Amino acid sequence: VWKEAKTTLFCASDAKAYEKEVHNVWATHACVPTDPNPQEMVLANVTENFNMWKNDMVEQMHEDIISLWDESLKPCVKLTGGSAITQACPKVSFDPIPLHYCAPAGFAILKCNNKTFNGTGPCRNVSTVQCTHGIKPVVSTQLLLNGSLAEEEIIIRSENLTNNAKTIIVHLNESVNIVCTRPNNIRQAHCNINESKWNNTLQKVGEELAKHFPSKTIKFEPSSGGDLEITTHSFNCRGEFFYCNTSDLFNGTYRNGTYNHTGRSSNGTITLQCKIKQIINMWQEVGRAIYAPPIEGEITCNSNITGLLLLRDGGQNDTETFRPGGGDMRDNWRSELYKYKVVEIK
Ligand SMILES: *[C@@H]1O[C@H](CO)[C@@H](O)[C@H](O)[C@H]1NC(C)=O
Ligand SMILES: *[C@@H]1O[C@H](CO)[C@@H](O)[C@H](O)[C@H]1NC(C)=O
Ligand SMILES: *[C@@H]1O[C@H](CO)[C@@H](O)[C@H](O)[C@H]1NC(C)=O
Ligand SMILES: *[C@@H]1O[C@H](CO)[C@@H](O)[C@H](O)[C@H]1NC(C)=O
Ligand SMILES: *[C@@H]1O[C@H](CO)[C@@H](O)[C@H](O)[C@H]1NC(C)=O
Ligand SMILES: *[C@@H]1O[C@H](CO)[C@@H](O)[C@H](O)[C@H]1NC(C)=O
Ligand SMILES: *[C@@H]1O[C@H](CO)[C@@H](O)[C@H](O)[C@H]1NC(C)=O
Ligand SMILES: *[C@@H]1O[C@H](CO)[C@@H](O)[C@H](O)[C@H]1NC(C)=O
């Protein structure tokens, strides 16, 4: 007595009504308090087909985050195709919160417990809950920040591996720490990553990729070209939009189980030059948004890289190249909603 049906979900959270952070402000009025303790209804001898690439839940989280940003991060100017809108854009407290998406009465959620599950195909080990796990609505490109990790090995997720245009989602099993700071140029910043740990990472990832390719050379290169939001690792820190140059990060070749990288510094750490931008291209809609100059003081963000977004170059020899990607924030949420599927208890 179960199948695949579309329904309108609601969110829950441990948001605090006294906190002036926008994620809390939005949540307390748009979400239900956490259960906060439902239970996993485990199932045996049952197999279902999940498809992280065609899932309503994602579009639903998409609209909410968009709404969340509409109330929270209001641009000074919003230019959309010739027309412009001005409005108050106060500086504010910004720091994402875990968001559990829940199913209404009559419906439930199916959870794949296969720790190797790639996001598509059958799943011989399922379960049941009313709400998903806490998901921080983190908007960023190239690198997935503050997500969950793969409990076992590194998983590679793509709607189609042989179609170089389909986005590759690498789910890391160990997190790489990243620290972006704008020290006391006012719009200048930088992010630090420990090479040795970024090295281990890309080797494991390199191998996991090799297992999906005819032992060709596997090179990593900076994004070919396009908007700054995509050609760079961009994200939001305390309300400020960081655009961090990643050309010293995705720079190395890994063939024959070997690992070789480029762009290091004395302390043995990779540094990324960043700019805090006022003019950005919106991820919510096709339109440009203009914000106020950066606040004062140390603007620093300490995050954990838990996944990558890649893009093979493909082409109609002996060398496959991948470049950082992103842009379509839906991918940022398939990487956390791959475990879930809405079902009708009907
Ligand atoms: C995921 O596993 C399915 C079989 O269950 C397979 O067809 C598909 O190629 C796999 N996807 C990736 C990207 O590993
Ligand atoms: C992390 O995942 C990679 C997948 O390639 C694996 O080689 C490594 O042993 C994993 N570490 C664990 C199991 O903690
Ligand atoms: C994967 O992508 C390739 C290249 O676009 C295409 O020829 C093939 O039909 C796709 N496979 C599936 C399962 O859609
Ligand atoms: C980064 O990776 C290279 C190649 O594996 C390694 O030799 C190097 O020691 C690592 N980082 C540093 C600076 O130790
Ligand atoms: C990143 O920095 C390098 C060296 O300064 C530069 O060549 C490259 O164009 C930068 N990337 C972008 C798109 O800003
Ligand atoms: C890799 O990084 C090095 C060191 O910054 C740089 O000189 C080189 O052009 C980069 N290679 C690319 C862009 O693939
Ligand atoms: C990532 O999570 C940490 C820990 O809560 C937080 O301090 C940091 O601001 C987050 N980074 C981003 C990009 O939101
Ligand atoms: C960041 O990653 C480290 C290392 O795994 C972990 O100890 C810490 O809890 C993480 N912080 C957050 C808030 O994800």
* CATH number assigned to the domain comprising residue 261: 2.170.40.20
Cβ-in-10-Å burial (0-12, 13-18, 19+) of 281 comes to middle
Provide the sign of the torsion angle of the four alpha carbons 77, 78, 84, 85, taken in this order. Answer: negative
Query: Which method, experimentally, gave rise to this model?
Result: X-ray
Question: Per this entry, what is the length of the chain?
Answer: 346
- Distance, CA of 282 to CA of 229 (rounded, Å): 9
- Could you tell me if 229 and 325 are in contact, meaning their C-beta atoms sit under 8 angstroms apart? no
For residue 257, the CA-to-ligand 2 centroid distance in Å is 14
Provide the sign of the torsion angle of the four alpha carbons 89, 90, 93, 98, taken in this order. Answer: negative
Beta bridge partners of 83: 80
For residue 240, the CA-to-ligand 6 centroid distance in Å is 28
For residue 289, the CA-to-ligand 7 centroid distance in Å is 23
For the CA of 156, the nearest atom of ligand 1: 13
Helix segments in the chain, DSSP class H: 22-30, 56-72, 195-210, 228-231, 331-337
Mutate-to-test residue for ligand 2 from 152, 171, 205, highest number of ligand atoms within 8 A of CB: 152
For residue 4, give both structure tokens. Answer: 């695949």
Provide the sign of the torsion angle of the four alpha carbons 238, 294, 304, 306, taken in this order. Answer: positive
For residue 75, give both structure tokens. Answer: 């641009």
- Distance, CA of 8 to CA of 27 (rounded, Å): 17
Among candidate residues 255, 253, 231, 257, the one with its CA nearest the CA of residue 243: 231
**Closest residue (by CA) to atom 2 of ligand 4?**
199
Quote the number of domains for the chain: 1
Would the CB of 260 count as within 6 Å of ligand 6?
Answer: no
DSSP-assigned letter for residue 287: S
- Distance, CA of 248 to CA of 250 (rounded, Å): 6
For residue 289, give both structure tokens. Answer: 């948004």
Describe the chain by its helix, strand, coil percentages, rounded to 5.
Answer: 15, 35, 50
Residues 6+ apart with CB under 8 A from 317: none
The residue behind tokens 């599950």 is: 117
SS3 label, residue 111: strand
Beta bridge partners of 310: 168, 324
**Closest residue (by CA) to atom 9 of ligand 2?**
153
The torsion angles phi and psi of 169, rounded to 5 degrees, stand at -110, 110
Helices 22-30 + 56-72 axis angle, to 10: 120
Interior angle at CA 13, CA 174 and CA 89, nearest 5: 95
SS3 label, residue 225: coil
281: containing domain: 1-346
For residue 79, give both structure tokens. Answer: 């230019």
Query: To what resolution in angstroms was this structure determined?
Result: 2.8
Helix segments in 148-259, DSSP class H: 195-210, 228-231
- Distance, CA of 187 to CA of 190 (rounded, Å): 10
- Could you tell me if 300 and 198 are in contact, meaning their C-beta atoms sit under 8 angstroms apart? no
